[model samples]
Target chain A: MVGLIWAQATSGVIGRGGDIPWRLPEDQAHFREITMGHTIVMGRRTWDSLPAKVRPLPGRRNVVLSRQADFMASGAEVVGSLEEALTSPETWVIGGGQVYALALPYATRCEVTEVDIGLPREAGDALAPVLDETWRGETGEWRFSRSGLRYRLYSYHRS
Target chain B: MVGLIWAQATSGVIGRGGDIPWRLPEDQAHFREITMGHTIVMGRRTWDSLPAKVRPLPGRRNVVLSRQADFMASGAEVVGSLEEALTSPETWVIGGGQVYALALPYATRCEVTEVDIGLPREAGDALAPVLDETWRGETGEWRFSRSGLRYRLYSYHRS
Candidate 1:
C-alpha cells in the first residue's frame, strides 16, 4: 500500500523558506507514529531539508529521489524517480512539494494534519497536493498543541 | 467593532467560477446565526453573485462596496469604500475576496468555517484573507453535513 502524509496550514502551505513554518511537537509525534517501520520516500530537497542528526530517519528505509546519479545520502538510498522508490511493499511518500505532486497519483491513502493558522499566499513555497472530489476524507476532533496551536487530523482514501 | 466571517476549504478557497463550489446548509445556518440583526458588508461582485431572491439578505443591513457612484442595489446600501461602510457600529465583513482583504486590518474578530475538502491551486479565484500570529484561534469539533462533507468552525480574536 502506498500512502502520503504531511501537515499543512489552512492555506495548504506545507513549507516556507525550505522548512516547516511552525513548531508542533504533537504533529511531529503523529508523523513518527504513522511512518515508523515503513519505507519512507522523499525528494532530494526534502532529504537535504532534514536536520543533520535526523537525516536517515531511524527504523525506516529512507529513499531520496534525485536526478543526480552520483548523489550520496549518508545512510539513505538514492532513486532517480518515484517509480524506483515505490519498489517496497509498504511505502509512505513524505514530501517537499514536487515529490508529493509526482507521487499523488500512486497513493491510495493520505494522512493530513490541518493546522488552524493561515499564511499569505506568497509566504510558502511548498503546498500540499490537491485532494479533490474523488477522495473521501474522514476527520477527527480538533486538538490544541502544547504551544496553543489548534489542529485536526484527516485520513483520506481514494473513492 | 468589526468582524469578518467566511467559510473556506482546506486550501483557503472561498469561491470558484464566481460562486461557492460546494453546498452545506449547516454552514449557511451558522452564517445566518452569526450575522442576523447585524450589518453585513461585502464587495460589489459578492452582492451581485447572490441569488436573486437572496439578494439584500433579509434580517440584516446589507452594505455593498463599489467604486461606481451611480451603482444602485434594490434594498441594500451602496458605498464607495470600506470607510463609508464602517459607519455601522456592529459590522461584519461578509466577503467575496477583495473586500475581505481591505477590511482585514480593521477587523477585531473573525469567524471561519473550515471545510475538509481541497481544490487545485488554479481552481479558486476568491480566497480567504490570511490570519497570522497576531490572531488567536479557537476551533470546534468536526461535524458532518447531511451531504457527507466534514467541516469545523473557528473563532479568532486579535491578540
Candidate 2:
C-alpha cells in the first residue's frame, strides 16, 4: 500500500522557512512509529530540510526525488520521478508540498496530524495535499502535546 | 462577548464561487443553534451570498458591513465598518473571509464545524481566519452526516 504521512496546522500549513514551524515531540514520535520500517519517499527539498544528524532517517530506506541527474543524497536512493520511488510494494510518501501533490493519485492511505494552531498563508511555504470526497476519513481523539498544542490524528482511506 | 462561528473544510475553505461549496444539513442546524437570538454581523458580500429568504436570518439581529453608504440590506441593518457592527454587547461575527479577519481580534470565542472534505486553493475564494496560538482549542467527537460526510465541532477561546 502507498501511504502518505504528514502533520499540518489548521490552515493546512505544513512548512515554514524550509522546516516544520512547530516543536511537537509527540508528533515526531508518531512519524517515527509509522514510517520506521517502511520505504519512505520524499522530494529533494524535503530531504534538504532534514537536520544533518538525521539526514538519512536511520531505520528506513530513504528515497529522494530530484530532477538533477547527478544529484546525490548521502545515504538515500535518488530517483528522477515518483514512479521510480514507488517500486517497493509498501512505501510512504513523506512530503514537501510538490511531492505530495504529485504522489497523491497513487496513495491508498493517508495519516495526518491535524494541529490546532494556525498560520496565515504567507507564513507557510508548503501545505498538505487537499483530499476530496473520494477519501473516507476517521478522526481520532484530540491530544495535547507537552508544549500545549492541541492535535488529533486522522486516517483517510481512498474509497 | 464577541463570538465567531463558521464551518470550513479541512483545507480551511469556507466559501467557493460566492457560496459555501458543500451542503451539510447538520452544520446548518449547528449554525442556527449557536447564533439564534444574537446579533450576527457579516460583510456585504456575505449578506449577498445568503439565500434571499434567509437574508435577515430569523431570530437574530442581522448587521451588514458595507463601504457603500447607500447599500440596502433589506431586513438587516447596514454599517460602514466592522467597528460599527460590534457595538452590541453580545455579537457573533458570521462571515465572508474579509469580515472574519477584521473581527477576529475582538472575538472571545469561536465555534467551528470542521468538515473532512477538502478543496484546492484555487477552488475556494474565501477561507477561515488564521487562528494563532493565543487561542485554545477543544475538539468534539467526530460525527457523520446523512450524506456520509465526517465532521467535528470545535470550540476555541482566546487566552
Candidate 3:
C-alpha cells in the first residue's frame, strides 16, 4: 500500500535548506527507513533542496512532479504528470508547497512529522498546506527523539 | 546532447554528501537546469541512498547498472549490462564511486563539482575512483554557488 509523508519539525523551518524543519537524525532515519523501496513524488523546488548525489533521496525510487515539463534528474524517474505518479504504487508527494497542494486530491493518506515551533510568517517556503481535518478520518502518532528536539510522526488516513 | 556534469575539481572522484568536495549552487543549477528532462545512469550502490518516496531524483529517467544480475528496481528499466546506460542520448551516469569509474571510460564528459573541503578521514564512499586524466579531454569552466559553498563546474570528454 502507498502512503504520503510530510516532514515538519519544532526547531526551525527552512524549506530550501537543511538549517531547519528537519534537524534530528531520527527524522532523517525515519524517512530513510519508511520510504526505502517506495516511490516518492516531489516538486521542482523541493527537488532542488537535495544534495545532488542523494537528490532522489537514495533508497526509494523518486518521481518529481513539476510544471516545468523539462526538468532533469541525473538518475531519477521523472514524470511531469501526477496522474501517472499516483497510478504508480506507493507514490508519496514529497514537496516544496505547490506540488503538495496539487497532489492532495489524489493522496490516500498523509504521514506528517509535525513541529511546535513558531515562524516569522515569511517562511514562505517552509509552509505546509492547510489540510482539512474532516477529510482525514483518523490519525496515528509516532514519536522520535534526538538533537534536542522532540518530534512526532503522524500517520493520517483519509476516511 | 547528454553530458555528465559535476565539479569535483579532479578528473575522477566521488564524495558522499555534498561536503566532500563541496560544489557551488550554480554547478547544481546547471546540473538541474540541463538535466531537467532526461534520465540518468548509475550503479546499484548509488541507487541505495534513495528515500522510498523520493528515492530516484525526479523529473528524469533512472537506469541502474549492476553486474549482480539480480538487482531490481520497481518500474526500473534494468539493463543486463552497462552498455545499455551509456548508449542513450538522454542518459548520464550520476556517481557514487564504482559507477563513475566504470562510466568514465565510456562517458563522453565528466562534470565534477570540485570543492576545497578536506576529505574527512572517514570520507570513504568510493573515493571518486582514480580518473586517468591522460585518457579524457575536457572543455569549459564555470564558477558557481550553492548553499553557501563555492565550486567550479568542469566537463570532460574522452580522449
Per-residue lDDT of model 2, residues A1-159, tens digit only: 578999999888899788888888888877776687678999999999988798899788899999999999999999998889998756899998889999999987788999989676674479999899877665668898998999887767653
How well does candidate 3 score on lDDT at residue A28?
64
Which of candidates 1 and 3 reaches a greater lDDT? 1
Candidate 1, A1-159: lDDT as tens digits: 688999999889898788888988888877776687779999899999988898899989999999999999988999998889998866899997889999999987788989989765574489999999767665667888997899887767662
Compose the digit string of candidate 3's lDDT tens values, residues A1-159.
Answer: 345666764432436353244466766655665566667877666677777866757667778776667878776767778776776545667775677778877765666776555544455556666667644322223343656655555545543
DockQ of every predicted complex: 0.05, 0.02, 0.01
Sort order, DockQ high to low: 1, 2, 3
- Residue B113, model 3, lDDT: 60
Error of 2 at A158 (Å): 1.4
| Two-way DockQ contest, 1 vs 3, winner | 1
The positional error of residue A149 in candidate 1, measured at the CA in angstroms, is 0.5
| Candidate 2 chain A lDDT trough over 10 residues, lowest sum | A116-125
Model 2 chain B scores worst on lDDT over the 10 consecutive residues at B81-90
Ranking by lDDT: 2, 1, 3
Q: lDDT tens string, model 3, B33-97?
A: 54555668766766766555865667777888877677787656667677776554456677666
- Which candidate do you rate higher for DockQ, 2 or 3? 2
Give the interface RMSD of candidate 3: 22.0
